[PDB]
């Protein structure tokens, strides 16, 4: 049962000092498709809960610092909800699908989101020295505090890992959207083809198979998008 009261107090300050700020970028849907919107809703929830749990972690480190100081004198959190996602694609017609896909920021906010959460991952996990054991504080109280610090340390690294996973979900949805724009017939081309059909009556039997292929392309894209955009909630552990 050795003590150094100076160390206890210094470590109290070190432990509750501000950690990296989590980003507050709001990820917006890349386009007007339901599957895109539901992805954004899921990210909003996951990221709100991450920030709420990170605020609870700051409380925990304050509470450790208070506990360290009260020693030296002597000498509501829930799961991230899952957003409902459509079981079946729902094939709207060509033009409306193309309009929905082409209306919105096309993934720009998702890149910014990912970038913020990625930086927070990388930086937060290099601020764990604050949870090391003591040099000259020994006994049961010291051992208890060391356990508690090590629990916070492990929780921080887990939070950093979940931050990386969430940023990747956002990148994944941005990639998906880019893929969907590359593959889906453009609004302008659908209108062009409808125009070609209207204006060329004798060509209409040659145009019909082309239009049917535009429809198969669209459906194929909407089926992928509906399926691949459904995200898992990010569910952090309690500190
Ligand atoms: Cl839709
Ligand atoms: Na295609």
């Amino acid at each position: 049962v050795t003590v150094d009261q100076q160390e206890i107090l210094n470590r109290a300050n070190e432990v509750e000092a501000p950690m990296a700020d989590p980003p507050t970028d709001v990820p917006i849907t890349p386009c007007e498709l339901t599957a895109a919107k539901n992805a954004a809703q899921q990210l909003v929830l996951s990221a709100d809960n991450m920030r709420e749990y990170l605020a609870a972690g700051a409380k925990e480190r304050q509470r450790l610092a208070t506990s360290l100081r009260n020693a030296a004198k002597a000498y509501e959190l829930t799961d991230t909800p899952r957003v409902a996602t459509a079981g079946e694609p729902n094939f709207m017609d060509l033009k409306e699908a193309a309009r929905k896909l082409e209306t919105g920021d096309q993934g720009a906010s998702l890149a910014h989101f990912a970038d913020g959460w990625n930086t927070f991952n990388l930086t937060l996990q290099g601020d764990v020295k604050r949870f090391r054991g003591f040099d000259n504080w020994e006994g049961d109280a010291a051992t208890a505090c060391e356990a508690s610090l090590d629990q916070q340390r492990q929780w921080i690294l887990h939070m950093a890992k979940l931050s990386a996973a969430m940023a990747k979900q956002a990148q994944y949805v941005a990639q998906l959207h880019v893929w969907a724009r590359r593959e889906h017939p453009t609004y302008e081309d659908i209108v062009g083809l409808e125009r070609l059909y209207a204006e060329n009556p004798s060509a209409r039997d040659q145009i019909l198979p082309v239009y049917a292929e535009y429809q198969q392309r669209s459906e194929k894209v909407l089926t992928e998008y509906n399926n691949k955009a459904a995200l898992e909630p990010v569910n952090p552990p309690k500190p």
Side-chain angles (χ1 to χ4, degrees), residues 33-34 92 100:
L33 294 183
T34 298
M92 65 213 99
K100 294 252 195 68

Side-chain angles (χ1 to χ4, degrees), residues 42-63:
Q42 189 58 85
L43 293 171
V44 170
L45 293 169
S46 291
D48 282 344
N49 212 22
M50 287 290 292
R51 277 186 294 263
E52 200 182 317
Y53 277 63
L54 290 165
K59 302 304 295 192
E60 172 60 19
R61 296 189 291 283
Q62 171 196 279
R63 189 207 69 80

